[PDB]
Design a protein around this ligand. Structure first.
Ligand SMILES: *[C@@H]1O[C@H](CO)[C@@H](O)[C@H](O)[C@H]1NC(C)=O
Ligand SMILES: *[C@@H]1O[C@H](CO)[C@@H](O)[C@H](O)[C@H]1NC(C)=O
Ligand SMILES: *[C@@H]1O[C@H](CO)[C@@H](O)[C@H](O)[C@H]1NC(C)=O
Ligand SMILES: *[C@@H]1O[C@H](CO)[C@@H](O)[C@H](O)[C@H]1NC(C)=O
Ligand SMILES: *[C@@H]1O[C@H](CO)[C@@H](O)[C@H](O)[C@H]1NC(C)=O
Ligand SMILES: *[C@@H]1O[C@H](CO)[C@@H](O)[C@H](O)[C@H]1NC(C)=O
Lengths: 158, 321, 321, 158, 321, 158
């Protein structure tokens, strides 16, 4: 997608990261595991929640069809009425489907962007003392131990 | 030693569409279109609809004898009428400005039927003889219960000068009619006089009806015609009736009690013994979705109607295989 | 030594909304919705509206004596009429196809009233006696100044055969009327004849009016009724009048001068002594914004109406705290 | 936001940069100060100006309500007229509010993107002979003096 | 040694617009708006339109003698009528509920004209004399070929009691008329009787017409008026005619064969001897584009109409100079 | 544009790359030339094709004007009919023009993004053993020969 991380340079997602949308996988002498990045996950939750509520709200003033009847010699006005009611429904159907299509794309991209920014945040911290593998991972020049790993996640490294 | 950045996958099978790509599998999604209903006609917020069954709005209001079930109806939430009700206008004819009356009715939740001109009046004219075999009740020739077909007494049809004052607070729907016999001989037989009229007046109405005699097809074995008129009589106003024949006269009229929110919905369904906050002609909806695709014509706290078959928003991200 | 990349902040407090985030503070913004008006009715581009005040379009055109202020009106930009004008139709009745006339009027900026049938004519019939106490002027019984209520002379009402040719270039609005008395005795008293008619003909019109006698509620102490008709007489066409009673006859008619852009706006406001390029029923707008939210019904070079309370575009960037 | 610079790896804006939307802060032995990048600021001005004019123009053919009157027995058509006029106004209100919402997001992101591209332009020039701090700043390995600073800004460095 | 990443350029001159930038030159583009037509009226899918030429829908159906070309018309795809057809209603008058008939006609592809009341009938009344110089054929005074203007025989106009049964499967369009003479003397001369009527009845229709006598402008040298009425006679129904003068009587009526998809389009164009799948009042379209900007009113498999002058999508990328 | 590659750090396109939208130019002792990157070009073709088909489909349920006639004393309803038909046409004209404007921008940006991601893919592979020039090009520390070049293009380098 637009930002190149999701199903791009990071080949696929993690079944094993269960507690968040984005996070870290670490691996060292003491072991290995997953940690959700809570701040970016929460930012994403708010954005997506607000988006859904914005979409619902903007669409709560759609056209409401009203029953209306006509006799045998009021055909022109009956037809006018019909084409008017259907006209609006077609406009609102289009509006709804398009907004969903377009915003679905914006949501996928937003996630992709959140992942790339999280990746850059770590790349900017690590700098020289790690090898950028090209697949989402950094391989440390120095031994890195759980508390070292923690400092990368919490943004206070080196 | 190695640290990696990554994102969530799961066993989700949910799919969303985008402009450039259809059926993208996502980790989470929110469906926003209600597609289900219950197939029943229900009370709206505790309030039963008026279900006309086999009666038309005309048959009900005029009091077609086949529509006795609706002699006295409590407050309704909405009215249900079939597409082609059999029990309408038992004696053939027309109902003048019918659709404008239907429209008026869609903004009314309660009628209260009161007597305005008693049958046991009309000392001059015969009231108990205005009956047809096309409007039967219990095997006998009967007629619309709310209007009186007046006939000559002792071969006399003296000019009628009758009037009613609306003492009530509430607007009053008043219905009357005229009979169009099919030849000169029927005129004399029903009414002695050859050239007749019905004149109706209120503060706004300036009416003069004249029977149109002519030969026409037998409809349900009848060649005569009835033509019904109505007005809304404002409170403190009076309606003036003057006629020397063909007068189908008010017995009962409707007090307009409620002026509630309403519609006449067209449905073949019968009462479902349920309650709902949102009713369609095809069934009721119970949903917190913002959209539905059931039917355009709803009443109550309803989602917005769209013609889509599917509306699903992505919330999560692209689920990897 | 160090070089940094960065972006502008300021003391801006301006806020904009996005899909994912409400009230984002931005360095610069452009508001595009006009929310203010001046609360007055003004001239449009130098051209004063016709403000009817307490008169209706009917009262004005027929020449209700209470509407003398509008005896001769200059070109207007638009017309203003109250929701419920008191001075309409001083003698009770109806104005036939009134709304289609109002509609026609909304595409007219100037009338020029000319005399077509003089009062000092009608040697056969009485013209100075057709006056009612319901239409007073200076404490005296008067009547619509543009039409003449003709009454019998010496107990005679000879058939009238009168006609007018439209010599003018311009289309002519012509108004006439019929009186509906409330009983047989009033007919003879006003008009000797018992059964009457008014026939009107032009190249397109084929009219025959007949008075409808009946008892009706007293409206402003009156039981009679007037019913007014109109036509647009094409240039070089002639209108043919024939009647033997109940004829309310043209004295004056309106030349259609302008055929300008216009509307009848409904407003309780009076003239404000101002000028504007954009007028609403609630006040005038002076703005370069593309939208406004004042009222749907405007005239002039106006912004587009929306129902929003707020429309603000970001131009600058997210202002940091 | 999507591009990660504004209120991302660059923590906040500059009250002291008064003459442009994006620019540079330098700091060396001779002193320190701000310089707007005129080319990208001007590109942004054009884009934003064009956008506002595009938005106004597309909306200058909205529906105009027209006064229309009906008698007591023309209720159905009166109501038809009302629901038609209101129907359009609801469509145009929605169109206007949504376009503003969506384009507001595109504008914020565009600024963010302009900042990131300006940052990358300098990173690509500086290369090895400076330390990428992770916060918008580059710290020079060699002493950098006003004319050195100037060559970074004007794109002709090394 | 060096490797570079890059993107395609070409000699393309194609330009697209964006929100922030107009006329961006792109390597590839897809235009989606059809701007061309062929300027002709064509057959739709092999099926020739009915081109009325100088006749109106009224002139055609009533059988204006100037409209002989349309005596018997095959199935059409759509109907074409000029804005102001000269050959309409040769004898002045009106066509009652004309627009509701036009509307009905727009959902009809084939008529089949059958005789319902023969001219060589009416032994009592003169049928061959109802002719006017305003409706000429070959220099002689003629009249609408589908209706018969009945006149007195031997100074007698006996009451007419005639009826027709719809034996056919198909709905039948039936047309009749009434003559409005311009004075008392014309009445007697055409019809002996002074006070006349035409009564028409079916199962739904309850009509009684009465001639309106009055003086009116000469239109094409004529002061009389014709007024034409119509009904749709359901199969197995019967129409009852009764009159003692002024009756313009059915000779021929139209069987409604097809009930196809159709429109009456307004165009000054004549037949173009071509075929198309999409026709506009200005010319035919042959396109695979989803939009066009030719005319709003089309028939066939058509692109969607927009008011744009230009709709071009980018497919490729920004072409470098 | 948003992603900074097209007419950004890559100054202009290649007349000489004829067989694809994005690709590589190589230059070494044996010679020089262009190679389209088939995978990203094909991804772009699908996206753009789908977009065009989505746009056409969403717009195939527009309002269809219907001929309707009125007499001299039905002016109000005639005008109602006219303002209704024109109202819809104005809505659909707006919908069509806006969708084209907005999606045209998304298409340009998508191309820009495809180019940037292709560039990053190569940067991530090359790492240290090449000099990032700042203009789309990488200059090798080691001699690179056609089969070496091939391994960069096919993603299997080093
Ligand atoms: C998307 O998947 C659905 C399954 O629900 C299928 O019916 C549809 O044809 C698919 N569309 C495309 C274009 O792949
Ligand atoms: C019309 O003619 C048919 C054929 O006999 C008949 O059955 C039908 O009843 C007639 N219509 C009426 C009204 O009788
Ligand atoms: C945004 O700020 C306005 C202040 O004008 C406030 O009224 C509104 O409630 C706020 N909305 C949200 C959701 O924060
Ligand atoms: C109707 O009756 C009331 C009650 O007396 C009366 O005041 C009112 O005037 C009557 N209506 C008319 C038209 O007089
Ligand atoms: C874009 O180019 C067209 C040439 O077809 C020109 O007419 C138009 O004025 C140009 N618009 C702008 C704003 O550059
Ligand atoms: C009306 O008067 C003009 C002026 O003489 C005349 O030419 C015209 O024919 C008249 N109208 C009619 C119907 O004759």
């Amino acid at each position: 997608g637009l930002f190149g991380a999701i199903a791009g340079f990071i080949e696929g997602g993690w079944q094993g990261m269960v507690d968040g949308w984005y996070g870290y996988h670490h691996s060292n002498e003491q072991g290995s595991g997953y940690a959700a990045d809570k701040e970016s996950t929460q930012k994403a939750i708010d954005g997506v929640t607000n988006k859904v509520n914005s979409i619902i709200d903007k669409m709560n003033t759609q056209f409401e069809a009203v029953g209306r009847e006509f006799n045998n010699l009021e055909r022109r006005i009956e037809n006018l009425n019909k084409k008017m009611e259907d006209g609006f429904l077609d406009v609102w159907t289009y509006n709804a489907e398009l907004l969903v299509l377009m915003e679905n794309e914006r949501t996928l991209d937003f996630h992709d962007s959140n992942v790339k920014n999280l990746y850059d945040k770590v790349r900017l911290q690590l700098r020289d003392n790690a090898k950028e593998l090209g697949n989402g991972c950094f391989e440390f020049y120095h031994k890195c131990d759980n508390e070292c790993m923690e400092s990368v996640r919490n943004g206070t490294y080196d | 030693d190695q640290i990696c950045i990554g994102y969530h996958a799961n066993n989700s099978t949910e799919q969303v569409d985008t402009i450039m790509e259809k059926n993208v599998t996502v980790t989470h999604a929110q469906d926003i279109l209600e597609k289900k209903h219950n197939g029943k006609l229900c009370d709206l917020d505790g309030v039963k609809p008026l279900i006309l069954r086999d009666c038309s709005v005309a048959g009900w209001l005029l009091g077609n004898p086949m529509c006795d079930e609706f002699i006295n109806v409590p407050e309704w939430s909405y009215i249900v009428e079939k597409a082609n009700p059999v029990n309408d206008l038992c004696y053939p004819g027309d109902f003048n400005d019918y659709e404008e009356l239907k429209h008026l009715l869609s903004r009314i939740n309660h009628f209260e039927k009161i007597q305005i001109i008693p049958k046991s009046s009309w000392s001059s004219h015969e009231a108990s003889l205005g009956v047809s075999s096309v409007c039967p009740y219990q095997g006998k020739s009967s007629f619309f219960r709310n209007v009186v077909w007046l006939i000559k007494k002792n071969s006399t049809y003296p000019t009628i000068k009758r009037s009613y004052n609306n003492t009530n607070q509430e607007d009053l729907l008043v219905l009357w009619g005229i009979h169009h016999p099919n030849d000169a001989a029927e005129q004399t037989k029903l009414y002695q006089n050859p050239t007749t009229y019905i004149s109706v007046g209120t503060s706004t109405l300036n009416q003069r009806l004249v029977p149109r005699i002519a030969t026409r097809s037998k409809v349900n074995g009848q060649s005569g015609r009835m033509e019904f008129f109505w007005t809304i009589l404002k409170p403190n106003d009076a309606i003036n009736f003057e006629s020397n024949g063909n007068f189908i006269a008010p017995e009962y009229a409707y007090k307009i009690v409620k002026k509630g929110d309403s519609t006449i919905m067209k449905s073949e369904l019968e009462y479902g013994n349920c309650n709902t906050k949102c009713q369609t002609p095809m069934g009721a909806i119970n949903s917190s979705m913002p959209f539905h695709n059931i039917h355009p014509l709803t009443i109550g706290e309803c989602p917005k109607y769209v013609k889509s078959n599917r509306l699903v928003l992505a919330t999560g991200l692209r689920n990897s295989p």
